[PDB]
Amino acid sequence: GTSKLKYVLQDARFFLIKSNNHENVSLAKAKGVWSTLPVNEKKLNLAFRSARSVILIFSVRESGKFQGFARLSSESHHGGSPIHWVLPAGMSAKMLGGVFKIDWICRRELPFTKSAHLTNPWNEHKPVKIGRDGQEIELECGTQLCLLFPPDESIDLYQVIHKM
Ligand SMILES: CC1=NC(=O)CC=C1
């Protein structure tokens, strides 16, 4: 069912995350972490304290898809287990902000072609697939985008609901 999902998304905030490559999404999926640039880190920290759920929706650039979405489970922190992000040549690990712990809500992909009817009011109502890294997606668009993903039957949102 979608009911616990809808509960987790109730009054969530949603942020488009752009990964340069699949390796970093796969590391995020395996490690339950994400790191972003300071400008997005501060937005996500602000959002994490402001909303019951902060949902990161991941898209690998040039993939034409979203690769799933995750709920922030912490603010960003530094010093932890280092993550060997395959970073775009031009960026160093120091350029990144701290590390967010995330709980994956959906590890399945969704092709952009399936979200072509969703516009993001916070990006001039451009298709929700369109957005810079860190782009916040308004609640209704964000919720409908997440409900478009194939259900991820490997995930039990029971523990996620407990965190919120
Ligand atoms: C982990 C990562 N985050 C980004 O915001 C860009 C590239 C790699």
Residue 122 in marked binding region: no
What's the gap in Å between 28 CA and the centre of ligand 1? 10
Give me the resolution in angstroms, 1 decimal: 1.9
What's the gap in Å between 164 CA and the centre of ligand 1? 25
Alpha-carbon distance of 13 to 48, in angstroms, equals 9
Alpha-carbon distance of 80 to 27, in angstroms, equals 15
Q: What is the DSSP letter of 20?
A: S
Residues touching ligand 1 (Cβ under 6 Å) are 19-20, 24, 35-37, 85, 87, 133
Q: What is the DSSP letter of 92?
A: -
* Residue 52 and residue 12 in contact, taking contact as beta carbons nearer than 8 Å: yes
Total structural domains within the chain: 1
For residue 8, the Cα-to-chain-centroid distance in whole angstroms is 14
Burial 1-20 (b: 16+ CB within 10 A, else e): eeeebeebbeebbbbbbbbb
Alpha-carbon distance of 139 to 80, in angstroms, equals 31
Alpha-carbon distance of 97 to 103, in angstroms, equals 19
Token code pair at residue 77:
């922190």
Q: How far is CA 124 from CA 115, 127, 131, in A?
A: 16, 9, 10
Token code pair at residue 127:
């298709």
Residues in the chain: 164
φ and ψ at residue 13, rounded to 5 degrees: -110, 155
Which residue type occupies 138?
E
Q: How was this structure determined?
A: X-ray
From 34, 61, 96, 132, give the residue whose CB has the most ligand 1 atoms within 8 Å, as the site to mutate: 96
Residue 113 structural domain: 1-164
Helix (H, G, I), strand (E, B) or coil at 52: coil
Alpha-carbon distance of 14 to 44, in angstroms, equals 10
Give the helix, strand, coil percentages of the chain, each rounded to 5: 35, 25, 40
* Residue 60 and residue 67 in contact, taking contact as beta carbons nearer than 8 Å: yes
Helix (H, G, I), strand (E, B) or coil at 57: strand
* Residue nearest (by alpha carbon) to ligand 1 atom 1: 35
Q: How many CB atoms lie within 10 A of CB 153?
A: 7
